[PDB]
Design a binder for these strands. Sequence first.
DNA 1: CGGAAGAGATTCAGAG
RNA 2: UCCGCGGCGCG
DNA 3: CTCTGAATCTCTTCCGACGCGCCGCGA
Lengths: 1342, 99, 50, 90
Amino acid sequence: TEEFDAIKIALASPDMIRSWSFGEVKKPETINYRTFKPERDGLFCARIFGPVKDYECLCGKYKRLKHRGVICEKCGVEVTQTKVRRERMGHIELASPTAHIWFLKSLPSRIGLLLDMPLRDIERVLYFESYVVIEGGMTNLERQQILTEEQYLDALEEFGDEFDAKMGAEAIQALLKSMDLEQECEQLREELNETNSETKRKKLTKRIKLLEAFVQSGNKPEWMILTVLPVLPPDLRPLVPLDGGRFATSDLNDLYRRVINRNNRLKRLLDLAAPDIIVRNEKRMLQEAVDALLDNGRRGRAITGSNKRPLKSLADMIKGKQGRFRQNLLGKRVDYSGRSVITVGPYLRLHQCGLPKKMALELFKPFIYGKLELRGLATTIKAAKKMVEREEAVVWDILDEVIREHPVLLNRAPTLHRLGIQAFEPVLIEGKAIQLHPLVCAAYNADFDGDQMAVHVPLTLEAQLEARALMMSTNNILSPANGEPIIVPSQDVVLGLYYMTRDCVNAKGEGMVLTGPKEAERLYRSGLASLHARVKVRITEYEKDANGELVAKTSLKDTTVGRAILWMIVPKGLPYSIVNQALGKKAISKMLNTCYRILGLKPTVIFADQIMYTGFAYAARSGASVGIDDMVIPEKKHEIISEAEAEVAEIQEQFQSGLVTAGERYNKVIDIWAAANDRVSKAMMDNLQTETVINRDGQEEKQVSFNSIYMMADSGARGSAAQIRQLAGMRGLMAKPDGSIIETPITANFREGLNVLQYFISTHGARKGLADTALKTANSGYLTRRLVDVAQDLVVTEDDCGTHEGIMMTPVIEGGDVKEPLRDRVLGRVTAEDVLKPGTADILVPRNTLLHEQWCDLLEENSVDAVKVRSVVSCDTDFGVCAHCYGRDLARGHIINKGEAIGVIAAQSIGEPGTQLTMRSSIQVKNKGSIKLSNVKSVVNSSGKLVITSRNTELKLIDEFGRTKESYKVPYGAVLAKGDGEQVAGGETVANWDPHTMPVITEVSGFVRFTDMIDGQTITRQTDELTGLSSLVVLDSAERTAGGKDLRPALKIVDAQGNDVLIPGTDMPAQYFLPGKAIVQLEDGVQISSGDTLARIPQITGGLPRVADLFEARRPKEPAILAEISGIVSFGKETKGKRRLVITPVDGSDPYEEMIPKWRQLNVFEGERVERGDVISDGPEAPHDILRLRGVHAVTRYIVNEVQDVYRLQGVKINDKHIEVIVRQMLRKATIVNAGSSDFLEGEQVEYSRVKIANRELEANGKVGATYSRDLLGITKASLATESFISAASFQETTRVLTEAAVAGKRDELRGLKENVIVGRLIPAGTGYAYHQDRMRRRAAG
Amino acid sequence: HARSTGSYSLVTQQPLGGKAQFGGQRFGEMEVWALEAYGAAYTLQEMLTVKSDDVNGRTKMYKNIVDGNHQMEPGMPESFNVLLKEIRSLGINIELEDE
Amino acid sequence: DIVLNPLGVPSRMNIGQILETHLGMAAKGIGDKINAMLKQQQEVAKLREF
Amino acid sequence: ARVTVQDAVEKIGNRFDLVLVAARRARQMQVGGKDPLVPEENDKTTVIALREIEEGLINNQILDVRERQEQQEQEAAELQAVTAIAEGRR
DNA sequence: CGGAAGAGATTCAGAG
RNA sequence: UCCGCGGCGCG
DNA sequence: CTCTGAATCTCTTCCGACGCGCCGCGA
Ligand SMILES: [Mg+2]
Ligand SMILES: [Zn+2]
Ligand SMILES: [Zn+2]
């Protein structure tokens, strides 16, 4: 229509709004009830808003279009269409101004901070409680002075008419119109440069920028106080009839009426010369009425109606989940849709869904009209309608003709991830249930216990082409969350295949030879041999040769009849070995995956369908079933339980003799019950799992049992070892609601009856779990909404940015366990640098190569330990990411195509598993390797051991090929029994430490001499009359005297002559201070060896909250402090609770001082040389400081590691890319440290793209570029921080962002996805992307 | 339940909700994100503008479908005009640019 | 008359329902026998003792 | 019927570009009424266009040159018509 | 309700 | 031809 | 002994899935 390019917002000038309005409304009247006609000058006055009916005058003067576009003479109504009623806005004119409640009440008082006034004063003047002052030079009274009534009278009775004092509305209007902007701008900036206080500086800066925003928008600030108030058109605030002729009035109409009434009252009291207090009361009521109209409930008590409910003001029509933004602009209701209960249909091919005939007829009724007239069977739409409503079977023939290639979309609420909507080619069935193919039903997360599903039909041919090419289920084989296929069988299919491939030691026809799988099928179907019988069969297989031909091979192999039968369906090219074992769920999954990699898409689809058919058929023929005799109870159980209860009695009587504390008695009982439960479980599994049967020759032999429940568990079709354990073994301990474990475990299994007590205590867990999931759903949905909002802008916009930067990928290893191999972390990513063959300079993998499966296998063969890959966070693309930095698209297998929206994919991929999350002294070598130290400094002693002065060293055990095997952190001062590079074996002790104390280490031998210490002041003389030998303890600051304050207890080391030995490498003396409350085992004046120690020192949350805190950039409550500077630590002044630490740079001239608290244990002893980003004290880690110290790569590695850790603990797989993209989206805001020659002001928040572009052009013309630091804002703030104010207003805090944009004079270019979705043009992603490129070229041409 | 076409609401001009009113299903925001995950722009545009809210575009679409031509002409969602009128009535001036 | 999937039973742990099924097969069993014992129209004393 | 389009996508490479090309081809086949280049077998214009691009007979540049030559034919008809009108006036 | 974040007001410590 | 509010109900 | 800045305390505001189905009531 109007083809707008952007949207602009600003304050409303009163002349502008008056120009909008086609008239003023002056009375609270709406419509007459004798005749349902609007009253003139009323809220629905037709003379203003136009006629109620098309071209119908209120007077009845004219009735048809012959006079279209003329006014009546008897009345001012116009001969036009009713649509104008929707458009035209009225206006009302107030006898007094009124503050617009938004600018007052918004969290920063924009008017208040503009005028520097406290909000209490502003409300006390605007609400008519006090006067305020405007000054004249003859009076000492200054302007903006608050003035109470007694002060008002006191001032006026001496200086009346010399100064002036007014109430809130008029005074604020006059003040705003009586101030200049440039003078206050310059005074504010001069104060900013002259002042120092950071609070004062930030207030000054925000005022400066507010004034700059007002001047650059040119919006006269006084406009913030309304003087003329718009009237919403009648249709948007409809008055709707009711039964009995009543009418429901929209609350907006009542608020408007009240405001009209108050305005009329105030004008009448003014024009008849009322006394002062009366008109003041009336105008205060009018101001309150306007506040109610705009934002009822925003201040004080909310207005309410007869229903005792608060009325919904205008602001409530846009705020909240019922608001206009969320309810209608997004999430429209749609035509051509249906819903129905779903149902299994196994006879369907993969790509076709069974759609009830009635729904098809209803949906395609327009298409049927069309084709029926086209084929000449019906002449007019009435004929078509009457024919289709009579269902003349020719309509059924036409209906079968129309849909033959017409895909439809199936959707299941909630649409957790994009698989939730899929496309199918319909097939017509009588009945009323929609029939799905079970395989895709598994992907839907759907079930068949009564889940409904909704169906939409695309209209246009471009739309149906999109549905076919993109959405058809034959395309969505690979999940976006990971590369593994999503179309995977379960339940009966897996059970059937498992039964079909399981062999037994002796069966009908064992040992015969079959010339081909067809004969195997014959012998099975003719009943002369059972599936399980082992036999030799001649089989042909094929392989993809070096050229790409399917070269054949034929041979005899040992197999089972069932296995040959299954092989017969396998397509050419897969090796026979894939089948020749007991096929579980995982085996079938990897079989489908290997089919998809070796062959194309369509052979895999056909293979899937054939698998489904054969599995179902043979499962049915199997007749597997569950019976009460199957859940065998191991007869050992009674004995084990008697033993356990005997031990319980023993420990209980041991406590009865008082030999132990009750807590340890509880612990012992719990331990023995757990041990007994495990023993019973093992006995049950052993008895169930295997059984003895006679062989062919007549002897007993063991084999895997065909017990039904065991077969179901072992196949992986359904159930688990836990459920089997509960079914037959004793189910064990259970927790009280506090999470503590009841001493008496539930002893009876499910097969025997549970007593009432066991059942009752068990119900605790059941209701805990149900409440748990009920609550978790909401948090998961909320989190997903957030992630989507933050990442929705990001789209692949170019092929290659040309960045050599990237991140280093190594396998994730914790505590000697390889939690994640390198192949998974690097598959599908592009090499940032050329990979070299280990130990050589030869290039193994070139730079900028997408690492597919063959490259990963090659990397594994050469045992490459680390790779460097391109990352989303390191991409140089502006307003997007390049295809090479993102890498392989999980859903397709190759490099991602241009124009794909990746952020939304990542957001859904993170959100969906969230439904599954839960929410309420020595080192031993594990295996062979070599010991290496990551970062260490070590000293060796007379005992032959090694003691370490690095506080964050890690042992790493390395493979003979240089790959890592194990790694473990080692505390300060631990003792080590081995040198670096020595060989190690499993179970070998290599290092030791006391975890219950902190030592202090002396590197060189010598004679200790106490220094800077006095007994009873810095140290006190412990003689442990109750414990043992003499000792000395440093007196804490509360215990030490003032003489012990500046004297810091220490010991120097001296030579044999008593001369103070120097540190071996520095000019500092070998001086070792004793921290507060430190303990030393040695007295003054004793010898100590090199590498020897003397010091004694006194020394979890749920997954979903943890991930929420990570992505919200939450500051941890005990932030570890790290060295902001490279230098030497140094002590200094002391004060209450906090120590004045200082770091002194080695070469730098700028020391820094920090208020390090003393209650946290310090890891610094006045000798620790330290570098930037090194830990000074431990604790939870603050992401912002990590970013400041160690850069973007450190923080991205930290975030990805934590999120992957929690998810892998749950067992869900999510590729790192979807976390890295979120991290890059978090990282937009930067701050300017110097402007160079740029126009940017210092300390401003700027989007990283803008400053990057500005610096690039600035250096492109040779000027000094600006410098910046990047700030990790939380995802909520980062989503609100965007320039696209429309998206922000859609998301949260609508009033705040609207006010901010309004005062700013913001403009949004409508470049993201959400904005275009609101507007309704094509999104700039996917197929729409191309449409935009031409447009932008035209916009470049324009 | 199934709805090809029927009644339309007064204020928002969107189709009615619920079986009793013979309304259509709701293409909730989660489904919109699902479409955004695909490159399927055209079906999204059709879902929002023509099928739902364009007071004239859906008439044109009905005409063309009856005629057997699967054209499309996206106008402007009337709910957007409703939002504009409410924001203006609030006293905040908002307007389109580059007409 | 009705065919149910067995796979649900171990994973939902509705073991009791299987027992119900068994009792059902027992219950109608007696019914069937007594039905036949009635259909042959034998002496009521025999069915009384049964 | 068409089980999958993946071969056509391989030919065009960009999946979305395939959708656009097939869309315009089907548009001109339906309203313009130009006949399919391959047998139709009671299929629909959509799958017809998909097969045609699958055979490599139809591609963005091929559409471009076809549109160019059709425009040249139309303008030749216009010029010959106006020359005939002038000959009628003379 | 509870938890988290922001803004304003009040109190304590350090420096003069 | 309709704005809801409250309530249960199934996903 | 006093003043300013920084830190701490108090008060106020915002947020805690999507989807359908019936019943009642309604200044
Ligand atoms: Mg279900
Ligand atoms: Zn008139
Ligand atoms: Zn890049």
